[PDB]
Amino acid sequence: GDYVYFENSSSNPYLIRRIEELNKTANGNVEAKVVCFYRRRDISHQLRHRELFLSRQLESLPATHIRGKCSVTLLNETESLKSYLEREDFFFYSLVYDPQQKTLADGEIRVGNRYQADITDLLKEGEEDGRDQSRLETQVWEAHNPLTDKQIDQFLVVARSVGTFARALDSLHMSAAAASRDITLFHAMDTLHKNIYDISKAISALVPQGGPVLCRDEMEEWSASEANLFEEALEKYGKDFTDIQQDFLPWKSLTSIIEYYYMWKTTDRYVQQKRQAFYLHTTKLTRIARRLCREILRPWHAARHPYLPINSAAIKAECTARLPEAVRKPLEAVLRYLETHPR
Amino acid sequence: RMDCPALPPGWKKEEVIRKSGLSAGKSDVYYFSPSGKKFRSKPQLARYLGNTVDLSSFDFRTGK
Amino acid sequence: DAVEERVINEEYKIWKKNTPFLYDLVMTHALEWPSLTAQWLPDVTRPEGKDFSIHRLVLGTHTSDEQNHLVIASVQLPNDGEFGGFGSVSGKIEIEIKINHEGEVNRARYMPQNPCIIATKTPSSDVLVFDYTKHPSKPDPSGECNPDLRLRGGYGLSWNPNLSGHLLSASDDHTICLWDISAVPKEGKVVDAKTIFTGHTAVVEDVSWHLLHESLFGSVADDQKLMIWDTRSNNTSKPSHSVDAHTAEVNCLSFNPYSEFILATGSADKTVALWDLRNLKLKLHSFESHKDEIFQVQWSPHNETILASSGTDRRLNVWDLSKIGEEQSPEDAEDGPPELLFIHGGHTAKISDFSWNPNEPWVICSVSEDNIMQVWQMAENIYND
């Protein structure tokens, strides 16, 4: 259960291991079974200098390999260590590392005029904020009404009944459910507020001239064939609702298709789940000038000395002054010479 | 073929529903360059564009 | 840099004045971009009633900024009392074809059976094959590379001269690839490898088919090894033979065209080693004189007993191995050994590649990293007394 510092054979820092079993053989030789602590590099920064990871790698090595004993603490105990008690011997672990798999338990803030907000000064006791509230909001339901829960509830039932009777005038349970959806209710809560919470006045609103009112959400409102189009466009373009419109329902507004989508997801029948250029030819005079002046030129010397300047004047003088006047040996012979005179 | 606004101008995305077999009903997503070259995966698209776009956070399937 | 370039510049001028005494032919021509490859195409067209003949090359750029090209350039060699003999090039070396290449071309070689088809190694592991008869002569300013066959998988590249279609190569994963394009599919531009020979530990630099022997080929790598291979052998991992060739990274190899047994290898230890396939334990000869690393070595098409070698030290040494161990003067010892025939000091930079002319004897084309290519023939009196 102790932790030890083993030989690092490369010269590098010691390898750390936990002792699982200490064994002595018959000839008195001592060997140890040891679980490896891996260094962060070897695990192949938030990692501290002294991080070590508990591996599933198990090895056995002789006791002579141990050069020192150490402490590999919990993370909390490392962080609690005092400055004086800080040592070379103290290490820590907080991770188990599978060495075979590689598995392991399971950005700047700026300052300046172009980052911070200009802070709005507190108004004087005489100063006024100057903010037009009608440009900012428009009320849709007052919470302190002369009405009671019962009456509102009742009105909601009535708003629902009208709705069902409305759609009876151009499936019973279906029409009632249709009329019971939220759009109708919301419309019922506005009808109340618009009519100043006067039940008697609000009911007129619902039956303006003896005729009822119909509120239909995009779900109910779409035609059979539009609904059909939608189920083809979805199954074909997934949830790409701009293309679903462009190619399948271009007469509908995007935002109505969205509202429809979500309402459709609850459908019953819906079951998704289960340098320097030049030329040279050399004249036939300067060709045999080299042969005539072989002793001055020395082609054997000049061939392996391209950056020695050849005496161009001398051979030209001697060639004009002295105007009036090879077998290679085969490859069989040279290979025979090379073996005869070897390295 | 839908414009993909987060890619450079002219790039388009198309989603195709599989009509039969083992994955009938699943879809495949394709991208097209402005010239009409077809791409079938994120690493293929990233190799083509190179450093002209950063696709680290690009969701190939949704185009966002 | 400032001092060494002045010393190199002066030495180029000294060399330039010596050229009528050292050479029979020198044609300098600055390329737009430097070329890491060079090879003479085998065909020659000798026009009616002229004093020259049109020979053709296989060059290629390596710029990592602008669009690269696979280049075929045509040079016009002459047909064999005032002294000297200059007359500034002017329309002798000219580009015939440019083909837009995907990335830089490290090496490019023609297929012996069909010289129109050219393979091309890239810095990637795969090889691109082009046919210059298919593509137009002048490319547009596009750079939309159109390779006829991509062959998926050091500057190793070698077509098999006996079996048409078999191509060898190096790769970044320390292995030797082997493709076959004898019966490629119609609907199938891309081709994959027939065999991958592992063998070497470090990066394989150069590979070469044997000339007379269909099946067996050689290879060379940074792990100091010369590995002779055999395609018929079932185990594609252990080679047929293996030699500790040199004391450093071996960069190239080349077989003798007149002997099936003899081959040469060049290496980073500043030596070209001569070998025999009948006994690879014994190294026959080690050519010493090169100042720095040898990166290329080539035997002469016409003469069995001479070979050339280039590298990173600006010179291209030409070795005549018919005069090994000849009794030369004591002053001539300081020049070099007798087997060293000629030193070519025309280039002022690392000679990337060169190639012997197959039709005209003693003519070599060499290219360097100062973007100059030079066609040249050493003087007649040096190579025969």
Curated annotation (Swiss-Prot), chain A:
Q: Which residues form the BAH domain?
A: 1-106
Q: Where is the ELM2 domain?
A: 107-210
Where in or outside the cell it occurs: the entry states:
Nucleus
Post-translational modification summary for this protein: Phosphorylation by CSNK1G2/CK1 triggered by estrogen enhances corepression of estrogen receptor (ER).
Cross-link Glycyl lysine isopeptide (Lys-Gly) (interchain with G-Cter in SUMO2 and SUMO3) mapped to chain: K316
Question: As annotated in Swiss-Prot or TrEMBL, what is the tissue specificity of this protein?
Answer: Widely expressed. High expression in brain, liver, kidney, and cardiac muscle, ovaries, adrenal glands and virgin mammary glands. Higher in tumors than in adjacent normal tissue from the same individual. Up-regulated in a wide variety of cancers including breast, liver, ovarian, and colorectal cancer and its expression levels are closely correlated with tumor aggressiveness and metastasis.
Coiled-coil blocks = none
Q: Where is this cross-link: Glycyl lysine isopeptide (Lys-Gly) (interchain with G-Cter in ubiquitin)?
A: K124
User: Ranges for the SANT domain?
Assistant: 217-269
Superkingdom is Eukaryota
Query: Briefly, what is this protein's role?
Result: Transcriptional coregulator which can act as both a transcriptional corepressor and coactivator. Acts as a component of the histone deacetylase NuRD complex which participates in the remodeling of chromatin. In the NuRD complex, regulates transcription of its targets by modifying the acetylation status of the target chromatin and cofactor accessibility to the target DNA. In conjunction with other components of NuRD, acts as a transcriptional corepressor of BRCA1, ESR1, TFF1 and CDKN1A. Acts as a transcriptional coactivator of BCAS3, and SUMO2, independent of the NuRD complex.
Q: What is known of its domains?
A: Isoform Short contains a Leu-Arg-Ile-Leu-Leu motif (ER binding motif).
Q: Which family does it belong to?
A: Belongs to the metastasis-associated protein family.
Clinical disorder: Involved in the epigenetic regulation of ESR1 expression in breast cancer in a TFAP2C, IFI16 and HDAC4/5/6-dependent manner.
Q: What is this protein called?
A: Metastasis-associated protein MTA1
Q: Which organism is it from?
A: Homo sapiens
UniProtKB/Swiss-Prot annotation, chain B:
Instruction: Kindly list any coiled-coil regions of this protein.
Output: none
Q: Phosphoserine modification sites?
A: S33
> Where in the cell is the protein located?
Nucleus; Chromosome
User: The MBD domain covers which part of the protein?
Assistant: 1-64
Tissues expressing the protein: Highly expressed in brain, heart, kidney, stomach, testis and placenta.
Subunit organization: Heterodimer with MBD3 (via N-terminus). Component of the MeCP1 complex that contains HDAC1 and HDAC2. Component of the nucleosome remodeling and deacetylase (NuRD) repressor complex, composed of core proteins MTA1, MTA2, MTA3, RBBP4, RBBP7, HDAC1, HDAC2, MBD2, MBD3, and peripherally associated proteins CDK2AP1, CDK2AP2, GATAD2A, GATAD2B, CHD3, CHD4 and CHD5. The exact stoichiometry of the NuRD complex is unknown, and some subunits such as MBD2 and MBD3, GATAD2A and GATAD2B, and CHD3, CHD4 and CHD5 define mutually exclusive NuRD complexes. Interacts with CDK2AP1. Interacts with DHX9.
Biological function: Binds CpG islands in promoters where the DNA is methylated at position 5 of cytosine within CpG dinucleotides. Binds hemimethylated DNA as well. Recruits histone deacetylases and DNA methyltransferases to chromatin. Acts as a component of the histone deacetylase NuRD complex which participates in the remodeling of chromatin. Acts as a transcriptional repressor and plays a role in gene silencing. Functions as a scaffold protein, targeting GATAD2A and GATAD2B to chromatin to promote repression. May enhance the activation of some unmethylated cAMP-responsive promoters.
The protein's name in its UniProt record:
Methyl-CpG-binding domain protein 2
Q: Which organism is it from?
A: Homo sapiens (Human)
From the broadest rank down, the organism's phylogenetic lineage runs: Eukaryota, Metazoa, Chordata, Craniata, Vertebrata
Gene name linked to the record: MBD2
Give from-to of the shown chain within the full protein: 149 to 212 of 411
From Swiss-Prot, chain C:
Job of this protein:
Core histone-binding subunit that may target chromatin assembly factors, chromatin remodeling factors and histone deacetylases to their histone substrates in a manner that is regulated by nucleosomal DNA. Component of the chromatin assembly factor 1 (CAF-1) complex, which is required for chromatin assembly following DNA replication and DNA repair. Component of the core histone deacetylase (HDAC) complex, which promotes histone deacetylation and consequent transcriptional repression.
UniProt xrefs under InterPro entries: G-protein_beta_WD-40_rep, Histone-bd_RBBP4-like_N, WD40/YVTN_repeat-like_dom_sf, WD40_repeat_CS, WD40_repeat_dom_sf, WD40_rpt, WD_repeat_RBAP46/RBAP48/MSI1
Name its cellular compartments.
Nucleus; Chromosome, Telomere
Q: Which GO terms of the molecular function aspect are on file?
A: histone binding; histone deacetylase binding; RNA polymerase II cis-regulatory region sequence-specific DNA binding
**Result when mutating N106A:** Loss of interaction with ZNF827 and loss of localization to telomeres
The record's section on Pfam families has: CAF1C_H4-bd, WD40
Corresponding gene? RBBP4
This chain belongs to which protein, by name? Answer: Histone-binding protein RBBP4
